[PDB]
């Protein structure tokens, strides 16, 4: 019953591959629904065409800033930044999907995909999903990041949506 969504990733406009995610709606429904709706575009805005603006090899890939494309923007489907739903799920290794934020109760649309175990984030960022298929595509994305997070090629969500 947990929704599945996909990203089709491109690198300087060239197709790279598809990453799919299981969203833990059974455990974090508000946070999963936000990401699901942004991935279908059904509210009139969302992740299609946006980029991964910060990628640190061995750490995480961060994206979801579809309004300012650099980490300063993005917005939820709720008309305002929303609360940390819970911290039930932990950052237990590669593939974990977790919300970026600006401190307690400031969730918008930015998210990151862990490429390692990042337990120091537990209790600070809401974990709400995990890569289901295509972890190898995230690993190929990671190689275009750098120590300070700047990417050497433009990584983009060329398409996205909900699978069934």
């Amino acid at each position: 019953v947990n929704p599945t969504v996909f990203f089709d990733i491109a690198v300087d406009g060239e197709p790279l591959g598809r990453v799919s995610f299981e969203l833990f709606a059974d455990k974090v429904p508000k946070t999963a629904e936000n990401f699901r709706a942004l991935s279908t575009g059904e509210k009139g805005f969302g992740y299609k065409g946006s980029c991964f603006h910060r990628i640190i090899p061995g750490f995480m890939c961060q994206g979801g800033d579809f309004t300012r494309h650099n980490g300063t923007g993005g917005k939820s489907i709720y008309g305002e930044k929303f609360e940390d739903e819970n911290f039930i799920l932990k950052h237990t290794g590669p593939g974990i999907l977790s919300m970026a934020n600006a401190g307690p109760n400031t969730n918008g649309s930015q998210f990151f995909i862990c490429t390692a175990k990042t337990e120091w984030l537990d209790g600070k960022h809401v974990v709400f999903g995990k890569v289901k298929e295509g972890m190898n595509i995230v690993e190929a994305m990671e190689r275009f990041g750098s120590r300070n997070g700047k990417t050497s090629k433009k990584i983009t969500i060329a398409d996205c949506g909900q699978l069934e």
Side-chain angles (χ1 to χ4, degrees), residues 24 27 29 47 58 65 74 86 105 113 116 133 143 146 152 162:
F24 303 143
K27 289 194 174 180
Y47 295 136
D65 180 357
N86 64 59
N105 305 306
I113 308 168
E133 206 157 27
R143 303 192 188 115
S146 71
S152 54
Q162 186 163 4

Side-chain angles (χ1 to χ4, degrees), residues 37-59:
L38 294 167
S39 297
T40 68
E42 67 196 59
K43 309 297 184 186
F45 53 86
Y47 295 136
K48 182 182 178 178
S50 67
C51 71
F52 279 83
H53 65 274
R54 179 181 180 77
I55 295 177
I56 297 176
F59 186 12

Side-chain angles (χ1 to χ4, degrees), residues 90-103:
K90 309 307 182 172
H91 297 81
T92 57
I96 291 281
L97 181 64
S98 184
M99 288 303 289
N101 62 52

Side-chain angles (χ1 to χ4, degrees), residues 129-148:
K130 184 186 192 47
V131 170
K132 180 187 210 195
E133 206 157 27
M135 193 61 207
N136 57 301
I137 298 305
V138 178
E139 290 168 347
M141 294 171 48
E142 194 181 15
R143 303 192 188 115
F144 297 109
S146 71
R147 182 181 184 178
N148 69 26

Side-chain angles (χ1 to χ4, degrees), residues 8-18 137 144 156 158:
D8 283 339
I9 304 299
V11 177
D12 285 342
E14 291 301 325
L16 182 70
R18 170 173 286 194
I137 298 305
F144 297 109
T156 57

Side-chain angles (χ1 to χ4, degrees), residues 112-127:
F112 58 103
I113 308 168
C114 300
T115 56
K117 175 177 166 181
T118 61
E119 71 280 359
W120 59 90
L121 305 179
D122 293 345
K124 290 179 186 184
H125 303 263
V126 175
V127 173

